[PDB]
Structures are given as structure tokens and as C-alpha cells.
């Protein structure tokens, strides 16, 4: 997928643990600490639901069919 | 089969988490909740669900949960101990 990060912004690619590999890729891309932010995705109700495990990222792989995974990050 | 566990903080939500669900039922459900939320520890929270009229009603037994699931998404509301 093409991940579109959002700081509450980035565009990188992901080739599919995949979770921390994605979280560390964001942590290393954005210079400002690992374990100091919280990843999120947008559900069908419009809320921002946090995910931090392989179990949850798969459910996020469901809730994005816009060809681009959008992640909103609180620090 | 899809639990959307709200984390109450400040009557309002703080951290929303969603996961699939199907070793009792209530224990497994509480086990997944204490493992998905970093702020939560086992035995240090209270799971709820909305009644037909909207009131938050707490549960902690498999006998409650099977009846509590009578209402395609199961929404749980968690209060910290």
C-alpha cells in the first residue's frame, strides 16, 4: 500500500511484524520518539480508532479501500 | 463479532479500539481488552454496554454477556479503576 500519514503528513510505500515495522517507519521518518505517538485509522462511523498490534492493523486493512492507507497520528 | 471498545475518560471517549470476537466468553473478551489497551491492566477496568434506553450497564459474567450481545458490531464502554 501507499501510506498517507497525518499529523494532528507523509507519503511512503508499504510492502506488508508488519505493525511495528510500520510504526518504526513512521517513528524514524518523522524526527520528532518511538513509543511516544499513537497510530489511528478512520472507521465507518468517522471516528479515529487507535491500533498498535498486528491484530488491529489487519482490521485497519479492511477500513481503507481508497487505494491509500491513511493514518492519523497523535503525539 | 466485532467489538468496538470505547475507553471513557474526562463520560467521553479517549481511546477507541476495534477487534474481532467469537476460557469463557466474558473472560476472553476481558482478556482481549486488557491486552489491546496499553493504559489498561487486567482487573483494572470495568466493561459496560448501552441498554435499550441508553443507560450504561456493567457486566462481568458470561451469563450477562450472551444476553448483552442480543442487541453487526458490539460496542463496549470501559471505565478505569
UniProtKB/Swiss-Prot annotation, chain A:
Residue ranges the record marks as coiled coil: none
Superkingdom of the organism of origin: Eukaryota
Chain spans, region Interaction with PAWR: 25-54
Subcellular location: Cytoplasmic vesicle, Autophagosome; Preautophagosomal structure; Cytoplasm, Cytosol; Nucleus, PML body
Tissue expression from the record: Ubiquitously expressed.
Outcome of mutating residue 56 to A: No effect on interaction with PRKCI
Induction entry: By proteasomal inhibitor PSI and prostaglandin J2 (PGJ2) (at protein level). By phorbol 12-myristate 13-acetate (PMA). Expression is directly activated by NFE2L2/NRF2; creating a positive feedback loop.
Effect of residue 6 to F: No effect on interaction with LCK
Region described as Interaction with PRKCZ and dimerization: 18-75
Variant or mutagenesis effect after changing residue 4 to A: Loss of interactions with PRKCZ, PRCKI and NBR1. Loss of dimerization
Cross-link (Glycyl lysine isopeptide (Lys-Gly) (interchain with G-Cter in ubiquitin)): 65
Location of the PB1 domain: 1-75
Positions carrying Phosphoserine: 13
UniProt PTM: Ubiquitination by UBE2D2 and UBE2D3 increases its ability to bind polyubiquitin chains by destabilizing the UBA dimer interface. Deubiquitination by USP15 releases target vesicles for fast transport into the cell periphery.
Oligomeric form and interacting partners: Homooligomer or heterooligomer; may form homotypic arrays. Dimerization interferes with ubiquitin binding. Component of a ternary complex with PAWR and PRKCZ. Forms a complex with JUB/Ajuba, PRKCZ and TRAF6. Identified in a complex with TRAF6 and CYLD. Identified in a heterotrimeric complex with ubiquitin and ZFAND5, where ZFAND5 and SQSTM1 both interact with the same ubiquitin molecule.
Functional note: Molecular adapter required for selective macroautophagy (aggrephagy) by acting as a bridge between polyubiquitinated proteins and autophagosomes. Promotes the recruitment of ubiquitinated cargo proteins to autophagosomes via multiple domains that bridge proteins and organelles in different steps. SQSTM1 first mediates the assembly and removal of ubiquitinated proteins by undergoing liquid-liquid phase separation upon binding to ubiquitinated proteins via its UBA domain, leading to the formation of insoluble cytoplasmic inclusions, known as p62 bodies.
Disease: Paget disease of bone 3: A disorder of bone remodeling characterized by increased bone turnover affecting one or more sites throughout the skeleton, primarily the axial skeleton. Osteoclastic overactivity followed by compensatory osteoblastic activity leads to a structurally disorganized mosaic of bone (woven bone), which is mechanically weaker, larger, less compact, more vascular, and more susceptible to fracture than normal adult lamellar bone.
UniProt free text on domains: The UBA domain binds specifically 'Lys-63'-linked polyubiquitin chains of polyubiquitinated substrates. Mediates the interaction with TRIM55. Both the UBA and PB1 domains are necessary and sufficient for the localization into the ubiquitin-containing inclusion bodies.
Name of the protein: Sequestosome-1
Organism: Homo sapiens
Gene: SQSTM1
Range within the parent protein: 4 to 101 of 440
Curated annotation (Swiss-Prot), chain B:
Effect of residue 55 to A: No effect on interactions with PRKCZ and PRKCI
Location(s), subcellular: Cytoplasmic vesicle, Autophagosome; Preautophagosomal structure; Cytoplasm, Cytosol; Nucleus, PML body
Residue ranges of every copy of the PB1 domain listed in the record: 1-81
Chain spans, region Interaction with LCK: 1-32
Induction of expression: By proteasomal inhibitor PSI and prostaglandin J2 (PGJ2) (at protein level). By phorbol 12-myristate 13-acetate (PMA). Expression is directly activated by NFE2L2/NRF2; creating a positive feedback loop.
Chain intervals for the UniProt region annotation (Interaction with PAWR): 32-62
Documented effect of changing residue 49 to A: No effect on interaction with PRKCZ
Outcome after substituting residue 64 to A: No effect on interaction with PRKCI
Impact upon substituting residue 62 to A: No effect on interaction with PRKCI
Tissues expressed in: Ubiquitously expressed.
Phenotype when changing residue 4 to A: Loss of interactions with PRKCZ, PRCKI and NBR1. Loss of dimerization
Entry-annotated residues carrying Phosphoserine: 20
Start and end residues of each stretch annotated as Interaction with PRKCZ and dimerization: 25-81
Post-translational modification summary for this protein: Ubiquitination by UBE2D2 and UBE2D3 increases its ability to bind polyubiquitin chains by destabilizing the UBA dimer interface. Deubiquitination by USP15 releases target vesicles for fast transport into the cell periphery.
Annotated disorder: Paget disease of bone 3: A disorder of bone remodeling characterized by increased bone turnover affecting one or more sites throughout the skeleton, primarily the axial skeleton. Osteoclastic overactivity followed by compensatory osteoblastic activity leads to a structurally disorganized mosaic of bone (woven bone), which is mechanically weaker, larger, less compact, more vascular, and more susceptible to fracture than normal adult lamellar bone. In a cell model for Huntington disease (HD), appears to form a shell surrounding aggregates of mutant HTT that may protect cells from apoptosis, possibly by recruiting autophagosomal components to the polyubiquitinated protein aggregates.
Domain remark text: The UBA domain binds specifically 'Lys-63'-linked polyubiquitin chains of polyubiquitinated substrates. Mediates the interaction with TRIM55. Both the UBA and PB1 domains are necessary and sufficient for the localization into the ubiquitin-containing inclusion bodies.
Quaternary structure and partners: Homooligomer or heterooligomer; may form homotypic arrays. Dimerization interferes with ubiquitin binding. Component of a ternary complex with PAWR and PRKCZ. Forms a complex with JUB/Ajuba, PRKCZ and TRAF6. Identified in a complex with TRAF6 and CYLD. Identified in a heterotrimeric complex with ubiquitin and ZFAND5, where ZFAND5 and SQSTM1 both interact with the same ubiquitin molecule.
Protein name per Swiss-Prot or TrEMBL: Sequestosome-1
